[PDB]
Amino acid sequence: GFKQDIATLRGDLRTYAQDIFLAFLNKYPDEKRNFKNYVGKSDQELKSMAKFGDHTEKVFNLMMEVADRATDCVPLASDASTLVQMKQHSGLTTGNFEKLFVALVEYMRASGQSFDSQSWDRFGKNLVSALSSAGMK
Ligand code: HEM
Numbered sequence: 001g002f003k004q005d006i007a008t009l010r011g012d013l014r015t016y017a018q019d020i021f022l023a024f025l026n027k028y029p030d031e032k033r034n035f036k037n038y039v040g041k042s043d044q045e046l047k048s049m050a051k052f053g054d055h056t057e058k059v060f061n062l063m064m065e066v067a068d069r070a071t072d073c074v075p076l077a078s079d080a081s082t083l084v085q086m087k088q089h090s091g092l093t094t095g096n097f098e099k100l101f102v103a104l105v106e107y108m109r110a111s112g113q114s115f116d117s118q119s120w121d122r123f124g125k126n127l128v129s130a131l132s133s134a135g136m137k
């Protein structure tokens with residue numbers, strides 16, 4: 001289920017973080033303009049960039065903590081507030097996060113592993129709602 005999925009993902013953290021982020025960037029190539037020097041590079045070129053692995057892991061580490069602190073796939077409002085106020089997230093909108101969770105859910109459904117994809121979809125929708133309530137446009 002959702003709780004065990006967190007453990008599954010944390011158990012192969014680097015690989016899942018990179019695969020899911022790349023799935024997002026490839027499903028929605030427009031989203032690359034939020035990042036520096038990701039344009040014009042294949043997945044393997046991105047994975048070999050300095051910062052890329054470090055960044056993707058730090059994002060994914062926090063996403064798993066937010067999922068782990070949720071009850072019934074409802075994230076804590078305080079976690080949403082932290083995500084809204086981060087300087088690195090200024091100018092983002094909830095649409096950026098909705099697209100990330102669309103890509104994550106699609107990746108889980110296409111995977112050979114048995115993820116609770118509908119719970120991740122609900123979690124993403126509840127996170128989007130919490131981000132709005134916390135002030136994200
Ligand atoms: C629940 C989802 C997310 C979480 C937990 C999260 C968390 C984080 C964290 C922890 C960092 C700091 C990384 C570091 O300094 O090494 C970061 C940076 C950043 N995030 Fe988010 N993030 C999320 C979603 C997104 C989305 C959807 C976007 C845009 C589509 C985004 C864009 C950025 C950018 C542009 C930065 C700074 C650029 C950089 O890391 O060099 N994030 N995020």
Ligand SMILES: Oc1ccc(Cl)cc1Cl
Pocket residue numbers: 017020021024055056057059060100
């Ligand atoms: O910037 C990111 C890094 C890793 C993941 Cl999974 C998502 C995002 Cl937006």
